[PDB]
């Protein structure tokens, strides 16, 4: 079928984190960081699962996800790799924490 109920809810949640409403503190996760330009030539060493919301949606669009748990897995993996790289005293972790809050309650309202 074209996106099961759980997966459709994923489409909506992802869409929200991608909406300009959150963009002000969601842009770090829209697309993968420009590590080479950022001076971060050690990015692929630390980040073993480089994932972003666009790729989460991409994979969702290819319907490679079976359930919203797989979505949750991939989206949270994005926030997870952020915490791997950036120490607690950085913008991207504070933005990750806040965006984690919204996404958390989005999935929390999502019934399974």
């Amino acid at each position: 079928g074209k996106l099961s109920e759980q997966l459709k809810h994923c489409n909506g949640i992802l869409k929200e984190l991608l909406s300009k409403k959150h963009a002000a503190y969601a842009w770090p996760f829209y697309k993968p960081v420009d590590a080479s330009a950022l001076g971060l030539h050690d990015y692929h060493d630390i980040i073993k699962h480089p994932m972003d919301l666009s790729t989460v949606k991409r994979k969702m669009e290819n319907r490679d996800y079976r359930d919203a748990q797989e979505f949750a897995a991939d989206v949270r993996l994005m926030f997870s790799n952020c915490y791997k790289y950036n120490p607690p005293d950085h913008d991207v972790v504070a933005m990750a924490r806040k965006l984690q809050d919204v996404f958390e309650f989005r999935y929390a309202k999502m019934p399974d």
Binding site: P28, L38, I46, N86, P87, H90, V92
Partner: peptide, 12 residues
Amino acid sequence: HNLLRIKQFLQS
């Protein structure tokens, strides 16, 4: 981690 390298997101 302890440090390594920090993302250049300082005032972006």
